[PDB]
Amino acid sequence: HSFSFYELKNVTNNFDERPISVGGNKMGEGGFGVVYKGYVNNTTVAVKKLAALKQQFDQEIKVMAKCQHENLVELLGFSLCLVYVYMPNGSLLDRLSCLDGTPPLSWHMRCKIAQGAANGINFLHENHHIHRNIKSANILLDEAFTAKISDFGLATVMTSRIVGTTAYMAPEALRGEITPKSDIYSFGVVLLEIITGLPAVDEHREPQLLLDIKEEIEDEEKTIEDYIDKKMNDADSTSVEAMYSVASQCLHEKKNKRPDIKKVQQLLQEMT
Amino acid sequence: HSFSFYELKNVTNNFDERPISVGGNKMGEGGFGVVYKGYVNNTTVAVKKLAALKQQFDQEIKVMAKCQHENLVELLGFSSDLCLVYVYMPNGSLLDRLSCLDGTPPLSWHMRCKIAQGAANGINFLHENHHIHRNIKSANILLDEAFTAKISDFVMTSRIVGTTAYMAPEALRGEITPKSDIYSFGVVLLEIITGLPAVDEHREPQLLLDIKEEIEDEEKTIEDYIDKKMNDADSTSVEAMYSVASQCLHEKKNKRPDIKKVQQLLQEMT
C-alpha cells in the first residue's frame, strides 16, 4: 500500500519531536530514522522518517515484500517515510524490566513470547534472510502480547561493514561473518533476559555481559535458580530448566554446534 | 635522560616523513605519533614525535619508568619542546622477519622458539607489573642484533572498527583484560608456525585464527600449514607449540592459560 507525504505529516502533528510521555509523537530512534506515532483511519500506526540514503529505503521494502508472518511486524505503506502496524505494549525489553510501572510478565506469557519470536526467525531463515540485530528491544509486543520482530535495518560470507549490538553478537559476527547461525546466538541472549529479567549488558554488575552467566553455571559457581527472575510466581523449575538448556545451546561458541531455528522451534514447543 | 628538540630535528633529518625504503627516516606510525630513525652520540635511536593532552606524554614515561626487562623495548629519554627516544632494534619486527621482508633469510625453527619464549617473558613481566598491553601483534614485537625478542607499544546499536585479526571476542565486545593479551599471543604463535599473516583478504580463511577450527574438525592438520621456509622444524615440537597456540585461542577467556603457564608450556618444549 501507498501513503501521502502530506497525510503522514499531519497525523503525527508535523512530526512532533516530543516524547509520548510528554504528549508528543516521538516513540523512539532507530532503524535509520525517527519513529513517530500516527493515526490513519481510526487506527494507530508507526511512522518512520529516515535520517542518518535512498539505498536503505528501497531495500526495506524488498525484504518486507517476501517476509510477512504472524510474528513479524507488518509494514502497511510508504512515501521520505515508512509505515508499520502499531504495537502498543512496546518492546520485550520494556516489559521484562517493568518500565513505567507495567506488571511483570508471567512465566506462561514469557514462554508464549519465546515460542512466538522463534517462529519469526524460523520464517526469515525459511525465506533465506538474516536479521543481524535480534535483541529484546526489537521484539515488539501487540495488544495480545504476540511477538512481533521489528527493526529490519540490517536485513562463508564476509564483510568490512561489521554491525549489530555487541552485547548480543556472536563471536563469528564480531569478526564480520554473516550467517543465520549468528541469529540463533543472539536469540540465546534474548532467552536469558526472559529467564532472568536482567539486561544483556550492565556496566555496574559482575558479570557485565549477561551471556557470561552461562559460564558461571557450567563451572557450578552458580545454579539457574540463582538467576531466575523473581518478579513472577508461576515459573516451575522443570520448564525453566528446559528453556535454559535451549538458551545454552544457542550459545555454543562453535557456530556449527548450534541448533538451527527449526530445532529451537521444537525444543520450545516440547517445553509445553 | 633528557634531549633537545632541535637536535632530534637534526639527527632525524628534519624528521624526514618519507619511509626508510626510499631514503627518509620514518620507520612506522604507532603509539599516537610517528617514529623516526635517529643517530646521536654513538647510539642509533628511534624517535617518536607525538601528534594530534600532555598528561599522555608523561604517562608513558611513568609506565616505562618501572617496566625495564630483558624483553621490553627500553626507553632512553624524552624531550618536551613532544618526543620519546627508544633503543633501536636493528632487525625490525617479527612480522617483517616472518615474511622475509627485503630479502632477509627465513628464521629457523630453533630461532623461532627462542623468540616465542622471549616475548612470553616480556608479556609475563607486564602482567606481573599489573599491565594490559592491549595490542600484542607480531609487529609490535621487535628484534635486536641478537634476535632477542623486544616487545613494544604499551554497546547500543553500533559498528566495530578495530583490527579483528588479533583481538579476542570479549575485547571486540569491549572487555579490557589480561586474558585478551593471551589470545593475541595465540595468533602470534600461528604466524610463527605458518609464516602466514594474521589476516589476508584474498585467502580462505581470511583470518589466520580460523585455521584452528579447520584443524579441530579434521578438515586439515597442523602439518598442512607449517612454514615451508624452515628446514629444522621437527613435527613433535611444532605440534607442541600448536598446542599452546590452541589453548591460548580458547573462545571463553577463563579457559585460556594464564601467561605464567604459557611460559612453562613453552619452556618444556625445548
Side-chain angles (χ1 to χ4, degrees), chain B residues 81-159:
Chain B
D81 309 325
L82 286 62
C83 316
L84 291 156
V85 180
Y86 297 90
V87 166
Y88 173 76
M89 301 292 182
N91 267 330
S93 67
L94 171 52
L95 163 68
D96 298 337
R97 279 336 114 208
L98 284 167
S99 44
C100 301
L101 173 53
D102 282 302
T104 72
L107 309 161
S108 59
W109 178 236
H110 177 246
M111 194 66 280
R112 288 182 215 213
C113 296
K114 300 306 296 165
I115 301 199
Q117 289 172 347
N121 288 9
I123 293 174
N124 168 270
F125 180 90
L126 276 186
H127 287 192
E128 291 177 335
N129 274 277
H130 301 273
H131 242 269
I132 292 194
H133 193 277
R134 307 267 301 289
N135 234 316
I136 306 300
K137 35 174 175 152
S138 72
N140 272 351
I141 298 170
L142 303 185
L143 299 172
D144 74 353
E145 216 184 319
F147 289 91
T148 280
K150 310 278 259 159
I151 275 152
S152 76
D153 207 347
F154 68 101
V155 184
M156 314 178 227
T157 351
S158 36
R159 65 155 307 141

Coordinates of all heavy atoms in Angstrom, one line a residue, chain B residues 81-159:
Chain B
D81 N 59.6 20.0 23.9 CA 59.6 21.3 23.2 C 58.7 21.2 21.9 O 57.6 20.7 21.9 CB 61.0 21.7 22.8 CG 62.0 21.6 23.9 OD1 61.6 21.9 25.1 OD2 63.2 21.2 23.7
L82 N 56.7 17.2 20.9 CA 56.9 16.3 22.1 C 57.3 14.9 21.7 O 56.6 14.1 21.1 CB 55.7 16.3 22.9 CG 55.5 17.6 23.7 CD1 55.3 18.8 22.8 CD2 54.3 17.5 24.7
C83 N 58.5 14.5 22.1 CA 59.1 13.2 21.6 C 59.6 12.2 22.7 O 59.9 12.6 23.8 CB 60.4 13.6 20.7 SG 60.1 14.9 19.6
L84 N 59.6 11.0 22.3 CA 60.2 9.9 23.1 C 61.3 9.2 22.3 O 61.1 8.9 21.2 CB 59.2 8.9 23.6 CG 58.2 9.5 24.6 CD1 56.8 8.7 24.6 CD2 58.8 9.5 26.0
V85 N 62.4 8.9 23.0 CA 63.6 8.2 22.3 C 63.8 6.8 22.8 O 63.8 6.5 24.0 CB 64.9 9.0 22.6 CG1 66.1 8.4 21.9 CG2 64.7 10.5 22.1
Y86 N 63.8 5.8 21.9 CA 64.0 4.4 22.2 C 65.3 3.8 21.7 O 65.9 4.3 20.7 CB 62.8 3.6 21.7 CG 61.4 4.0 22.2 CD1 60.6 5.0 21.6 CD2 60.9 3.3 23.3 CE1 59.4 5.3 22.2 CE2 59.7 3.6 23.9 CZ 58.9 4.6 23.3 OH 57.7 4.9 23.8
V87 N 65.7 2.7 22.3 CA 66.8 1.9 21.8 C 66.4 1.2 20.4 O 65.4 0.5 20.3 CB 67.2 0.8 22.8 CG1 68.0 -0.3 22.1 CG2 67.8 1.4 24.0
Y88 N 67.2 1.5 19.4 CA 66.9 1.0 18.1 C 67.1 -0.5 18.0 O 68.0 -1.1 18.6 CB 67.8 1.7 17.0 CG 67.8 1.2 15.6 CD1 66.7 1.4 14.8 CD2 68.8 0.4 15.1 CE1 66.6 0.9 13.5 CE2 68.7 -0.1 13.8 CZ 67.6 0.1 13.0 OH 67.6 -0.4 11.8
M89 N 66.2 -1.2 17.3 CA 66.2 -2.7 17.2 C 66.6 -3.1 15.8 O 65.7 -3.2 14.9 CB 64.9 -3.2 17.6 CG 64.5 -2.9 19.1 SD 65.6 -3.6 20.3 CE 64.9 -3.1 21.8
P90 N 67.8 -3.3 15.5 CA 68.2 -3.4 14.1 C 67.6 -4.5 13.2 O 67.8 -4.5 12.0 CB 69.8 -3.6 14.2 CG 70.0 -4.1 15.6 CD 69.0 -3.4 16.4
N91 N 66.8 -5.4 13.8 CA 66.3 -6.4 12.9 C 64.8 -6.3 12.6 O 64.2 -7.1 11.9 CB 66.6 -7.8 13.5 CG 67.9 -8.3 13.0 OD1 68.2 -8.1 11.8 ND2 68.5 -9.2 13.7
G92 N 64.2 -5.2 13.1 CA 62.8 -4.9 12.8 C 61.8 -5.8 13.5 O 62.2 -6.5 14.4
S93 N 60.6 -5.8 13.1 CA 59.5 -6.5 13.7 C 59.6 -8.0 13.4 O 60.1 -8.3 12.3 CB 58.1 -6.0 13.4 OG 57.8 -6.2 12.0
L94 N 59.1 -8.8 14.3 CA 58.9 -10.2 14.0 C 58.1 -10.5 12.7 O 58.4 -11.4 12.0 CB 58.2 -10.9 15.1 CG 57.8 -12.4 14.9 CD1 59.0 -13.2 14.4 CD2 57.2 -13.0 16.2
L95 N 57.2 -9.6 12.4 CA 56.4 -9.8 11.2 C 57.3 -9.6 10.0 O 57.2 -10.5 9.1 CB 55.2 -8.8 11.2 CG 54.5 -8.6 9.8 CD1 53.7 -9.8 9.4 CD2 53.6 -7.3 9.9
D96 N 58.1 -8.6 10.0 CA 59.0 -8.3 8.9 C 59.9 -9.6 8.7 O 60.2 -10.0 7.5 CB 59.8 -7.1 9.1 CG 59.0 -5.8 9.2 OD1 57.9 -5.8 8.6 OD2 59.5 -4.8 9.8
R97 N 60.4 -10.2 9.8 CA 61.2 -11.3 9.6 C 60.5 -12.6 9.2 O 61.0 -13.5 8.6 CB 62.0 -11.5 10.9 CG 63.3 -10.6 11.0 CD 63.8 -10.1 9.7 NE 63.6 -8.7 9.6 CZ 63.5 -8.0 8.5 NH1 63.5 -8.6 7.3 NH2 63.3 -6.7 8.6
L98 N 59.2 -12.8 9.7 CA 58.5 -14.0 9.3 C 58.2 -14.0 7.8 O 58.1 -15.0 7.2 CB 57.2 -14.0 10.0 CG 57.5 -14.5 11.4 CD1 56.3 -14.3 12.3 CD2 58.0 -16.0 11.3
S99 N 58.0 -12.8 7.2 CA 57.7 -12.6 5.8 C 58.9 -12.4 5.0 O 58.8 -12.2 3.8 CB 56.7 -11.5 5.5 OG 57.1 -10.3 6.3
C100 N 60.1 -12.5 5.6 CA 61.4 -12.3 5.0 C 61.4 -11.1 4.2 O 61.9 -11.0 3.0 CB 61.7 -13.5 4.1 SG 61.8 -15.1 5.0
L101 N 60.9 -10.0 4.7 CA 60.8 -8.7 4.0 C 62.2 -8.2 3.6 O 63.2 -8.5 4.3 CB 60.0 -7.7 4.9 CG 60.1 -6.3 4.3 CD1 59.6 -6.3 2.9 CD2 59.2 -5.4 5.1
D102 N 62.3 -7.6 2.5 CA 63.5 -7.0 1.9 C 64.6 -8.1 1.7 O 65.7 -7.8 1.4 CB 64.1 -5.9 2.8 CG 63.3 -4.6 2.6 OD1 63.3 -4.1 1.5 OD2 62.7 -4.1 3.6
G103 N 64.2 -9.4 1.6 CA 65.1 -10.4 1.2 C 66.0 -11.0 2.3 O 67.0 -11.5 2.0
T104 N 65.6 -10.8 3.5 CA 66.3 -11.4 4.6 C 66.1 -12.9 4.7 O 65.2 -13.4 4.0 CB 66.0 -10.7 5.9 OG1 64.7 -11.1 6.4 CG2 66.1 -9.2 5.8
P105 N 67.0 -13.6 5.3 CA 66.7 -15.1 5.3 C 65.6 -15.4 6.3 O 65.2 -14.7 7.2 CB 68.0 -15.7 5.7 CG 69.1 -14.6 5.7 CD 68.4 -13.3 5.3
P106 N 65.0 -16.6 6.1 CA 63.9 -17.1 7.0 C 64.4 -17.6 8.3 O 65.4 -18.4 8.4 CB 63.3 -18.3 6.2 CG 63.9 -18.1 4.8 CD 65.2 -17.5 4.9
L107 N 63.9 -17.1 9.4 CA 64.3 -17.6 10.7 C 64.1 -19.1 10.8 O 63.1 -19.6 10.3 CB 63.5 -16.9 11.9 CG 63.3 -15.4 11.9 CD1 62.1 -15.0 12.8 CD2 64.6 -14.8 12.5
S108 N 65.1 -19.8 11.3 CA 65.0 -21.2 11.6 C 63.9 -21.5 12.6 O 63.4 -20.6 13.3 CB 66.3 -21.7 12.1 OG 66.6 -21.0 13.3
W109 N 63.6 -22.8 12.8 CA 62.6 -23.2 13.8 C 63.2 -22.9 15.1 O 62.5 -22.4 16.0 CB 62.3 -24.7 13.6 CG 61.4 -25.2 14.7 CD1 61.6 -26.2 15.6 CD2 60.1 -24.6 15.0 NE1 60.5 -26.3 16.4 CE2 59.6 -25.4 16.1 CE3 59.3 -23.6 14.4 CZ2 58.3 -25.1 16.6 CZ3 58.1 -23.3 15.0 CH2 57.6 -24.1 16.0
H110 N 64.5 -23.2 15.3 CA 65.1 -23.0 16.6 C 65.0 -21.6 17.0 O 64.7 -21.2 18.2 CB 66.5 -23.6 16.7 CG 67.2 -23.4 18.0 ND1 68.3 -22.5 18.1 CD2 66.9 -23.9 19.2 CE1 68.7 -22.5 19.4 NE2 67.9 -23.3 20.1
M111 N 65.3 -20.7 16.1 CA 65.3 -19.3 16.4 C 63.8 -18.9 16.7 O 63.6 -18.1 17.7 CB 65.8 -18.4 15.2 CG 66.1 -17.0 15.6 SD 67.4 -16.8 16.8 CE 66.6 -17.1 18.3
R112 N 62.9 -19.4 16.0 CA 61.5 -19.0 16.2 C 61.1 -19.4 17.7 O 60.3 -18.7 18.3 CB 60.6 -19.7 15.2 CG 60.7 -19.0 13.8 CD 59.7 -19.7 12.9 NE 60.3 -19.8 11.5 CZ 59.6 -19.7 10.4 NH1 58.3 -19.5 10.5 NH2 60.2 -19.8 9.3
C113 N 61.6 -20.6 18.2 CA 61.1 -21.0 19.5 C 61.7 -20.0 20.6 O 61.0 -19.7 21.5 CB 61.5 -22.4 19.8 SG 60.8 -23.7 18.8
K114 N 63.0 -19.6 20.4 CA 63.6 -18.7 21.3 C 62.8 -17.4 21.4 O 62.5 -16.9 22.4 CB 65.1 -18.4 21.0 CG 66.0 -19.6 21.0 CD 66.0 -20.5 22.2 CE 66.5 -19.8 23.5 NZ 66.1 -20.5 24.7
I115 N 62.5 -16.9 20.2 CA 61.7 -15.6 20.0 C 60.4 -15.7 20.7 O 60.0 -14.8 21.5 CB 61.5 -15.3 18.6 CG1 62.9 -15.1 17.9 CG2 60.7 -14.0 18.5 CD1 62.9 -14.4 16.6
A116 N 59.7 -16.8 20.4 CA 58.4 -17.1 21.1 C 58.6 -17.0 22.6 O 57.9 -16.2 23.3 CB 58.0 -18.4 20.8
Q117 N 59.5 -17.8 23.2 CA 59.8 -17.9 24.6 C 60.1 -16.5 25.1 O 59.6 -16.1 26.2 CB 61.0 -18.8 24.9 CG 60.7 -20.3 24.7 CD 62.0 -21.2 24.8 OE1 63.1 -20.6 24.8 NE2 61.8 -22.5 24.9
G118 N 60.8 -15.8 24.3 CA 61.2 -14.5 24.7 C 60.1 -13.5 25.0 O 59.9 -13.1 26.1
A119 N 59.3 -13.3 23.9 CA 58.1 -12.5 24.0 C 57.1 -12.9 25.2 O 56.5 -12.0 25.7 CB 57.3 -12.4 22.7
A120 N 57.1 -14.1 25.5 CA 56.2 -14.5 26.6 C 56.8 -14.0 27.9 O 56.0 -13.7 28.8 CB 56.0 -16.0 26.6
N121 N 58.1 -13.9 28.0 CA 58.7 -13.4 29.2 C 58.4 -11.9 29.4 O 58.2 -11.5 30.5 CB 60.3 -13.7 29.2 CG 60.6 -15.1 29.4 OD1 59.8 -16.0 29.4 ND2 61.9 -15.4 29.5
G122 N 58.4 -11.2 28.3 CA 58.1 -9.8 28.3 C 56.6 -9.6 28.7 O 56.3 -8.7 29.4
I123 N 55.8 -10.4 28.1 CA 54.4 -10.4 28.4 C 54.1 -10.7 29.9 O 53.3 -10.1 30.5 CB 53.5 -11.3 27.5 CG1 53.6 -10.7 26.1 CG2 52.1 -11.3 27.9 CD1 52.9 -11.6 25.1
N124 N 54.8 -11.7 30.4 CA 54.6 -12.1 31.8 C 55.1 -11.1 32.8 O 54.5 -10.9 33.8 CB 55.4 -13.4 32.1 CG 55.5 -13.7 33.6 OD1 56.4 -13.3 34.3 ND2 54.5 -14.4 34.1
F125 N 56.1 -10.3 32.4 CA 56.6 -9.2 33.2 C 55.5 -8.2 33.3 O 55.3 -7.6 34.4 CB 57.9 -8.7 32.7 CG 58.5 -7.6 33.5 CD1 59.4 -7.9 34.5 CD2 58.2 -6.3 33.2 CE1 59.9 -6.8 35.2 CE2 58.8 -5.3 33.9 CZ 59.6 -5.5 34.9
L126 N 54.9 -7.9 32.2 CA 53.9 -6.8 32.0 C 52.6 -7.2 32.8 O 51.9 -6.3 33.3 CB 53.6 -6.6 30.5 CG 54.5 -5.7 29.8 CD1 53.9 -5.5 28.4 CD2 54.6 -4.3 30.5
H127 N 52.3 -8.5 32.9 CA 51.1 -8.9 33.7 C 51.4 -8.9 35.2 O 50.5 -8.9 36.0 CB 50.6 -10.2 33.2 CG 49.9 -10.2 31.9 ND1 49.2 -11.2 31.4 CD2 49.9 -9.2 30.9 CE1 48.7 -10.9 30.2 NE2 49.1 -9.7 29.9
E128 N 52.7 -9.0 35.5 CA 53.0 -9.1 36.9 C 53.1 -7.6 37.5 O 52.8 -7.4 38.6 CB 54.3 -9.8 37.1 CG 54.2 -11.3 36.9 CD 55.5 -12.1 37.0 OE1 56.6 -11.5 36.9 OE2 55.4 -13.3 37.3
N129 N 53.6 -6.7 36.6 CA 53.5 -5.3 37.0 C 52.1 -4.7 36.7 O 52.0 -3.5 36.5 CB 54.6 -4.5 36.2 CG 55.9 -4.5 36.9 OD1 56.2 -3.7 37.8 ND2 56.8 -5.4 36.4
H130 N 51.1 -5.6 36.8 CA 49.7 -5.2 36.6 C 49.5 -4.3 35.4 O 49.3 -3.1 35.6 CB 49.1 -4.7 37.8 CG 49.2 -5.6 39.0 ND1 48.2 -6.6 39.2 CD2 50.1 -5.7 40.0 CE1 48.5 -7.2 40.3 NE2 49.6 -6.8 40.8
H131 N 49.7 -4.8 34.2 CA 49.7 -4.0 33.0 C 49.0 -4.8 31.8 O 49.3 -5.9 31.5 CB 51.1 -3.6 32.6 CG 51.4 -2.1 32.6 ND1 51.2 -1.4 31.5 CD2 51.7 -1.3 33.6 CE1 51.5 -0.1 31.7 NE2 51.8 0.0 33.0
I132 N 48.2 -4.1 31.1 CA 47.5 -4.7 29.9 C 48.0 -4.2 28.6 O 47.8 -3.0 28.3 CB 46.0 -4.6 30.1 CG1 45.4 -5.4 31.2 CG2 45.3 -5.0 28.8 CD1 43.9 -5.6 31.2
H133 N 48.6 -5.0 27.8 CA 49.2 -4.5 26.6 C 48.2 -4.0 25.6 O 48.4 -2.9 25.0 CB 50.1 -5.6 26.0 CG 51.0 -5.0 24.9 ND1 50.6 -4.8 23.6 CD2 52.3 -4.6 25.0 CE1 51.7 -4.3 22.9 NE2 52.7 -4.2 23.7
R134 N 47.2 -4.8 25.4 CA 46.1 -4.5 24.5 C 46.3 -4.5 23.1 O 45.5 -4.1 22.3 CB 45.5 -3.1 24.9 CG 45.2 -2.9 26.4 CD 43.8 -3.2 26.7 NE 43.0 -2.3 25.9 CZ 42.9 -1.0 26.2 NH1 43.5 -0.5 27.2 NH2 42.1 -0.2 25.4
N135 N 47.5 -4.9 22.7 CA 47.9 -4.7 21.3 C 49.0 -5.7 20.8 O 49.8 -5.4 19.9 CB 48.4 -3.3 21.0 CG 47.6 -2.7 19.8 OD1 47.4 -3.3 18.8 ND2 47.2 -1.5 20.0
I136 N 49.1 -6.8 21.5 CA 50.0 -7.9 21.1 C 49.7 -8.3 19.6 O 48.7 -8.9 19.4 CB 49.9 -9.2 22.0 CG1 50.1 -8.8 23.4 CG2 50.9 -10.2 21.5 CD1 51.4 -8.2 23.8
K137 N 50.6 -7.8 18.7 CA 50.5 -8.3 17.4 C 52.0 -8.6 17.0 O 52.8 -8.1 17.7 CB 49.9 -7.4 16.4 CG 50.1 -5.9 16.6 CD 49.5 -5.0 15.5 CE 49.6 -3.5 15.8 NZ 49.7 -2.7 14.5
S138 N 52.3 -9.3 16.0 CA 53.6 -9.7 15.6 C 54.4 -8.6 14.9 O 55.3 -8.8 14.1 CB 53.7 -10.9 14.7 OG 53.2 -10.6 13.4
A139 N 54.2 -7.3 15.2 CA 54.8 -6.2 14.5 C 55.0 -5.1 15.6 O 55.5 -4.0 15.3 CB 53.9 -5.7 13.4
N140 N 54.6 -5.5 16.8 CA 54.9 -4.7 18.0 C 55.9 -5.6 18.8 O 56.1 -5.3 20.0 CB 53.6 -4.4 18.8 CG 52.9 -3.2 18.4 OD1 53.5 -2.4 17.6 ND2 51.7 -2.9 18.9
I141 N 56.4 -6.6 18.2 CA 57.4 -7.4 18.8 C 58.7 -7.2 18.0 O 58.9 -7.7 16.9 CB 57.1 -8.9 18.8 CG1 55.9 -9.1 19.7 CG2 58.3 -9.7 19.3 CD1 55.3 -10.6 19.6
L142 N 59.7 -6.4 18.5 CA 60.9 -6.1 17.7 C 62.0 -7.1 18.0 O 62.0 -7.9 18.9 CB 61.3 -4.7 18.0 CG 60.2 -3.7 17.7 CD1 60.6 -2.3 17.9 CD2 59.8 -4.0 16.3
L143 N 63.1 -7.0 17.2 CA 64.2 -8.0 17.3 C 65.6 -7.2 17.3 O 65.9 -6.5 16.3 CB 64.2 -9.0 16.2 CG 62.9 -9.8 16.1 CD1 62.9 -10.7 14.9 CD2 62.9 -10.7 17.4
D144 N 66.3 -7.4 18.4 CA 67.6 -6.7 18.4 C 68.8 -7.4 17.6 O 68.5 -8.2 16.7 CB 68.1 -6.6 19.9 CG 68.6 -7.9 20.5 OD1 68.5 -8.9 19.8 OD2 69.1 -7.9 21.7
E145 N 70.0 -7.0 17.8 CA 71.0 -7.5 16.8 C 71.3 -9.0 17.0 O 71.8 -9.7 16.1 CB 72.3 -6.7 17.0 CG 73.1 -6.5 15.7 CD 74.4 -5.8 15.9 OE1 74.5 -4.9 16.7 OE2 75.5 -6.2 15.2
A146 N 70.9 -9.5 18.2 CA 71.0 -11.0 18.5 C 69.7 -11.8 18.3 O 69.7 -13.0 18.6 CB 71.3 -11.1 20.0
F147 N 68.7 -11.1 17.7 CA 67.3 -11.6 17.5 C 66.7 -12.0 18.8 O 65.8 -12.8 18.9 CB 67.3 -12.9 16.7 CG 67.5 -12.6 15.3 CD1 68.8 -12.7 14.7 CD2 66.4 -12.2 14.5 CE1 69.0 -12.4 13.4 CE2 66.7 -11.9 13.1 CZ 67.9 -12.0 12.6
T148 N 67.1 -11.3 19.9 CA 66.3 -11.2 21.1 C 64.9 -10.6 20.9 O 64.8 -9.6 20.1 CB 67.0 -10.5 22.2 OG1 68.0 -11.4 22.8 CG2 66.0 -10.0 23.2
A149 N 63.9 -11.1 21.5 CA 62.5 -10.5 21.3 C 62.4 -9.3 22.3 O 62.6 -9.4 23.5 CB 61.4 -11.5 21.6
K150 N 62.0 -8.2 21.7 CA 61.8 -7.0 22.5 C 60.4 -6.5 22.1 O 60.1 -6.1 21.0 CB 62.8 -5.9 22.2 CG 64.3 -6.3 22.3 CD 64.9 -6.4 23.7 CE 65.7 -5.2 24.1 NZ 65.9 -4.9 25.6
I151 N 59.5 -6.5 23.1 CA 58.1 -6.1 23.0 C 57.9 -4.6 23.1 O 58.4 -4.0 24.0 CB 57.2 -6.8 24.1 CG1 56.8 -8.2 23.7 CG2 56.0 -5.9 24.4 CD1 56.5 -9.0 24.9
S152 N 57.1 -4.0 22.2 CA 56.9 -2.6 22.4 C 55.5 -2.1 22.2 O 54.6 -2.9 21.8 CB 57.8 -1.8 21.4 OG 57.3 -1.9 20.1
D153 N 55.2 -0.8 22.4 CA 54.0 -0.1 22.3 C 53.0 -0.4 23.4 O 52.1 -1.3 23.2 CB 53.4 -0.5 20.9 CG 52.5 0.7 20.4 OD1 52.1 1.6 21.1 OD2 52.1 0.6 19.2
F154 N 53.1 0.2 24.5 CA 52.3 0.0 25.6 C 52.4 1.0 26.7 O 51.7 2.1 26.6 CB 52.6 -1.4 26.2 CG 54.0 -1.4 26.9 CD1 54.1 -1.3 28.3 CD2 55.1 -1.5 26.1 CE1 55.4 -1.3 28.8 CE2 56.4 -1.5 26.7 CZ 56.5 -1.4 28.0
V155 N 28.0 0.0 23.5 CA 27.1 -1.1 23.3 C 25.7 -0.7 23.2 O 24.8 -1.1 24.0 CB 27.3 -2.2 24.3 CG1 26.4 -3.4 24.0 CG2 28.8 -2.6 24.5
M156 N 25.3 0.2 22.2 CA 24.0 0.3 21.7 C 24.1 -0.3 20.3 O 25.0 -1.1 20.1 CB 23.5 1.7 21.7 CG 23.8 2.5 22.9 SD 23.4 4.2 22.9 CE 24.8 5.0 23.5
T157 N 23.2 0.0 19.4 CA 23.4 -0.5 18.0 C 24.5 0.3 17.3 O 24.4 1.5 17.0 CB 22.1 -0.3 17.2 OG1 21.0 0.0 18.0 CG2 21.8 -1.7 16.5
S158 N 25.6 -0.4 17.1 CA 26.8 0.2 16.6 C 27.6 -0.6 15.5 O 27.1 -1.6 15.1 CB 27.8 0.6 17.7 OG 27.7 -0.4 18.8
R159 N 28.8 -0.1 15.2 CA 29.7 -0.9 14.3 C 31.1 -1.0 14.8 O 31.7 0.1 15.1 CB 29.6 -0.3 12.9 CG 30.1 1.1 12.8 CD 30.6 1.4 11.3 NE 31.5 0.4 10.9 CZ 31.5 -0.1 9.7 NH1 30.7 0.3 8.7 NH2 32.4 -1.1 9.4

